[PDB]
Subunit: 353 residues, 4 copies
């Protein structure tokens, strides 16, 4: 039975080694966060508009001014190769077949260059800054290979305390490559090329990356730039003031700070304050979750675990199936609430509970 | 033990094939909706009025200006024959013996004409529009055979995603007839009588049916007309403005949109805004549920699954028993809260929790 | 282990026949009411006053202007003989030894006269009106035998729908006497003494008893009169206006109307509106429950099932033990919240949750 | 697996005799209090400040004007020797190695003098007053041996009703010493030295200790004085007015009054009203719990059971490990919410839920 995202989660759990499944599904500490990410959607119910002609529906929408098949994206997730062989390519091809963007992680198992050469869809690059020089190298690499959008993830200044991994002594799978860091010299001696080696031989990121650093990145990247990991309208607004073209409200799927609010709690406020694209992720599993966020003003929703379940369970085809189910889910929901054009969604279709 | 509706549900589950029971009991997706439909009643508790003479009580009430034994109706449910042989007739005869109306579904297993010929009670007809011409045919058929009231169901523009049915590969029982669509010609060639054949060979309804179409139906039907499936005071009000004589607030028993609000959430508002009869269904199982809705202003409550449990468990007699229990339940409740005349119910007997 | 009321409930369940225990513990319908009666106490928490000299504490308090050892009473419960031999006398003697009143039920197994002759404590009489003449007879009997206070129970106009009893086909135990109705003639022919026989051969009360009838009772009884079963400040106030000396807010321990509010929900309002003694029962099990009600203004709390568990488990001694535990519980609580004199309790010691 | 406080609780339960574990873990009556102490932390979630340089973090903070490694303390707990041999010394040495204060209980198994001679850390003394003269003796003893701060515990005027202990007939372990009461004469005859003997041969404290008595203690102790066990801003304020240098909001870990509010419910109010140090304990287990209290204004958090689990499970090393985990937890949390300096915490990092 594969009729929804949960069914794929169940199949993924049966096919993945326990430790890998725990690494995928787990959250920080007590996992009250991942639970809250799901529960928060129950804070809204639908108030359908009846007797509306919904015989012709449209899920097409512009994201950052660019039209795509539906307001969804496959978000950045690292080590996809640990879930399925060439997982990054499988996800990218599925997203492309579905008409939506795919975001490559800095911690991907397939290089920025290799993916761009094997997939002609809308590719976005998610940046983690460990070393400034190295980050600049990846950004320019993404720029020269055709990536349209750059996403800076800011919520991993330090690593999340995920206790399932600690119990399993989880170790990055051997057959797994941190490809984007491949070839980066040594032999070279001196502050950097030594200060850089010391940063790469560390599992932590640049915790000093601040607003000033964002300005630096803004000048380096000429196309659309989004800041991911925000949990307040104030931070979202500051990002826009600093040059960002939009933001991605997110708590990293409950994997970093167990007691973090769900981004849904500041979505409407961020939309009203910034006046710029506000994308969102964390906790989305049903089409109704997605429609609620869009109704509150979100530009688009990024999928994390939902499509990874499809990938882990059935590879590229699994991802295709999950996207197909979610699209039909969203479409069905639009028909049921009387909003034939997805771009017409508004808070008026919701009831606060 | 058959002392309440739940007892009949239990007996029905024991007598019906699993797949049929799932088709009856199931809701859309996570079934949070059917649960919410039940839980919402706990939002109100009773504040009885003591030392009131309740030695003489009356459940008699006018519905759409017509007196009936109690403010209940057996609502429209399709494929009743799948629950018990000649289920439509069993329900109709039980309703008639109880002094309340019975609403025949467009998807009934007994024809509009056959029921009218075998039952002299107050028969209502519920219309689903798949093809305009065909719908017009059924409406006139109902008109000519004595049906007093027409109910347009508007919440199935597309089919609900009921996962139990998907798991069971549920198929409309073979010995089961969609009688009202019987004999409708073919052989005939041309747009319609081809555009009509194409619509009938489809399990979906006319998703384009809108306010303009309601006006069309309003002119076709000369008697009382109600619009069913509304979940907002605004839509209820528009229905009245368009000619409807009343509305039926409903989320189709949680079978269409899992995250829909319960109609109880907009009952008081709809009553105050429309100033016309506001009937309601979805989630009613105890007499207290019914009394709460009536106290909030509902004209009457339509039963869906409650009487179907009686039907599935013990046929016509089972329906009689459920109606008898519910009537005694309502009567007992009226005595206990100090409101001897059911028409005297008001919000004053309730406490918001 | 017998350290609290729950421990006695557990022991009572082990010693009583299942059907008798169900008759004692059961509530109306879904039993959401008995649960709510318990849960409502969690709506308040304590805010102790520290550094208060609590070396000398007093639980003594006036109830209806008469001093008693503590603000508790053993409330009226019928058929006590079904729980323990001569249960009425056991409860009365325990209450008397504890320095608190005992209320005899109209449905007691020991007569008004016999109890008064075998117990010299403060005896109250609870009246159920089935037949006016018969009620007048019992009232005068109670008056002539020394009962100090009369309590009219108004929440059983019709019998509660207790489904455990229906499942067990519960029948009033054979060795059990409805003593107060003993000897009341027949042979006599004519309206009454025929209209009265017809009322006694019925398990229902006088559902017509109203405000006018209360006035009648008020003139018949010369001492303190309380009206029991009220669930609104408005009704409590009307009772005072009609002559009552106080009221007992109660939902009959969740045995009559499952969806009734808990009397705790209207306690403060009733105290403020009436300006007269407001006693209360329903759901009290811990000393903290009792102290919360007293802090909100209740004059006293009547125990129903709490002391019946002591009775069913260990007879008179069991009741003594429960009263001893509850008194020590209340005393301990007063010390802990910094209110040495029970009459000094106020809302200031509580925090609404 | 020892990655958090709960893991140590689990290990402690496996190593301690059931009755000892129950004595440690148990709460008063229904234990709704200990549960509420944990649940209340979910009333707040974090709203991280992104793009803040958190590469350099500091947990250093002043408590009562004195700098310590982090805003934590090992609070006063009696009979520590029942959990691990020389438990008081183990806890003190661990606290000292961690750079935080340790508070010795009046009911400790190691004397005030012996601890001061074997540990050079910041030692605080918690006072329970059973007999004024005896209390004065301990206070001066603590003064002369180097204790920097005096804590008066006011929430045990009478003993809490902990039912686990009653079920286990819990008795203070034989090999266990109430050392601070050692040698206190007898043979001596007369009011006191007879009135004092009678008070010591009692398991109850001086329930008369009031505001006047606090003034007495204030004049006796020349250094920092804190009053522990407060549950209201009003009492906290009165303590400051009476001479206290700060307070410790606490419900004694849910061990005294089951229905007491959690001190977290009056933390912000106490901070705003008193304008003096407000420390707090009761329910703290995760670094997030601690950070939430500090953000609301708490000067420091005292650990009760958290470090006792470390002690019971693995002695001094266990305590060291728990403190190490909690410090890394707090540090990690500060980085994640964007507040590098612990003294910069404010309500702005929280979202009320
Ligand atoms: C296995 C896994 C790995 C992840 N790796 C990254 C990463 O490399 N970069 C990033 O920006 N976010 C990363 N994320 C976070 C996701 O982008 C996204 O915020 C999160 O999954 C959304 O929540 P959801 O899983 O409930 O959909 C990861 C999430 C998961 C589940
Ligand atoms: C088995 C089943 C079939 C149904 N078929 C129809 C139908 O043909 N027409 C219609 O208007 N509603 C239909 N409904 C919805 C009911 O009219 C009603 O809205 C719903 O059952 C009310 O909720 P309840 O089941 O909790 O009482 C159906 C419901 C059930 C349970
Ligand atoms: C077994 C049983 C019999 C009762 N019989 C009577 C009665 O004869 N008269 C009356 O006024 N109330 C009667 N009551 C109600 C009690 O007076 C009281 O309202 C109720 O028990 C309070 O709730 P509690 O059981 O939670 O304490 C009865 C309750 C029980 C449990
Ligand atoms: C086993 C045990 C013994 C205690 N003994 C004392 C004591 O002697 N003096 C005191 O002031 N508090 C005493 N307390 C209360 C603690 O100081 C502190 O208020 C409480 O443990 C805080 O809650 P927590 O256990 O959830 O951290 C004790 C607590 C426990 C668990």
């Amino acid at each position: 039975n594969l009729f929804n995202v949960e069914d794929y989660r169940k199949l993924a759990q049966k096919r993945l080694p326990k430790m890998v499944y725990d690494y995928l599904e787990g959250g920080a500490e007590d996992e009250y966060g991942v639970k809250h990410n799901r529960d928060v959607f129950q804070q809204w119910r639908f108030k359908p508009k009846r007797l509306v002609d919904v015989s012709r529906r449209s899920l097409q929408a512009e994201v950052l001014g660019k039209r795509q098949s539906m307001p969804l994206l496959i978000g950045p997730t690292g080590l996809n190769g640990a879930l399925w062989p060439k997982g990054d390519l499988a996800l990218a091809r599925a997203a492309t077949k579905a008409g939506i963007p795919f975001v490559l992680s800095t911690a991907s198992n397939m290089s920025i260059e290799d993916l761009a050469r094997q997939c002609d869809g809308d590719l976005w690059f998610q940046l983690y800054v460990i070393h400034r020089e190295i980050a600049q190298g990846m950004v320019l690499k993404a720029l020269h290979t055709g990536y349209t959008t750059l996403v800076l993830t800011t919520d991993v200044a330090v690593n999340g305390y995920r206790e399932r991994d600690l119990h399993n002594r989880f170790k990055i799978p051997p057959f797994l490559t941190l490809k984007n860091f491949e070839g980066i010299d040594l032999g070279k001696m001196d502050k950097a090329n030594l200060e850089m080696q010391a940063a790469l031989m560390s599992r932590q990121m640049d915790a000093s990356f601040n607003w000033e650093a964002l300005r630096w990145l803004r000048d380096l990247w000429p196309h659309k730039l989004l800041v991911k990991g925000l949990l307040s309208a104030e931070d979202a607004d500051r990002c826009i003031a600093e040059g960002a073209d939009g933001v991605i409200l997110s708590n990293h799927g409950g994997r970093q700070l167990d007691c973090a609010i769900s981004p849904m709690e500041v979505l409407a406020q961020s939309v009203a304050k910034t006046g710029k694209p506000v994308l969102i992720d964390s906790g989305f599993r049903r089409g109704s979750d997605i429609v609620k966020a869009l109704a509150l003003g979100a530009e688009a929703v990024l999928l994390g675990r939902a499509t990874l379940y499809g990938l882990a369970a059935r590879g590229e085809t699994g991802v295709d199936e999950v996207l197909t189910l979610l699209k039909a889910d969203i479409d069905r929901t639009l028909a049921q609430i009387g909003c034939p054009d997805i771009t017409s969604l508004s808070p008026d279709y919701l009831q606060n509970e």
